[PDB]
Amino acid sequence: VNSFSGYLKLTDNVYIKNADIVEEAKKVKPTVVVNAANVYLKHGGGVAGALNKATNNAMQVESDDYIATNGPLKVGGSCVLSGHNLAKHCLHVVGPNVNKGEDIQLLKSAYENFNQHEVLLAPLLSAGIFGADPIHSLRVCVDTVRTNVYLAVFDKNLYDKLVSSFL
Numbered sequence: 431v432n433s434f435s436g437y438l439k440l441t442d443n444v445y446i447k448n449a450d451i452v453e454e455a456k457k458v459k460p461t462v463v464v465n466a467a468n469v470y471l472k473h474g475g476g477v478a479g480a481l482n483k484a485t486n487n488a489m490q491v492e493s494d495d496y497i498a499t500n501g502p503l504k505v506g507g508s509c510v511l512s513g514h515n516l517a518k519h520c521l522h523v524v525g526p527n528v529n530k531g532e533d534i535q536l537l538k539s540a541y542e543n544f545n546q547h548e549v550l551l552a553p554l555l556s557a558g559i560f561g562a563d564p565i566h567s568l569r570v571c572v573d574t575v576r577t578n579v580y581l582a583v584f585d586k587n588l589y590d591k592l593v594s595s596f597l
């Protein structure tokens with residue numbers, strides 16, 4: 431048993447809810463929240479900007495030190511940093527950004543990072559402002575992630591469409 435509430439069960443391991451991931455993280459305090467990061471860990475908008483704002487910019491301060499030491503992530507890659515006030519850990523995962531011209535085939539590699547964690551609260555990778563088709567992102571998630579993932583879908587209209595169209 432875990433603390434996640436009100437999710438629709440899609441598969442053995444994938445659950446989904448219409449939720450603000452910031453509000454969900456604040457309520458659940460999961461072991462792992464996933465950030466929709468870029469390779470620079472520059473948390474300006476979407477989930478990253480919202481998560482970072484909720485940490486009072488502490489996520490960005492920690493991230494800048496990480497990049498100064500290690501250099502940028504890879505598209506498809508990840509790093510584990512603090513979850514600050516939102517979670518034990520934040521798994522920063524870089525899905526391909528279609529609005530920057532990145533290979534959508536990298537989305538499966540991005541989701542493979544989730545398999546290193548038994549349970550995660552996460553957004554749909556490459557969805558929202560990263561420009562991918564969220565229906566596709568959900569299909570790759572279901573077909574890639576084997577650990578237990580709780581997906582927060584910000585947009586109520588997209589949530590309804592993802593559930594209704596799910597195979």
Ligand SMILES: O=C(O)CN1C(=O)c2ccccc2C1=O
Pocket residue numbers: 553554557558559564582583584585586588589
């Ligand atoms: O719902 C989310 O989680 C991510 N996401 C989208 O994929 C999307 C598409 C069109 C309008 C708003 C949004 C949005 O927020």
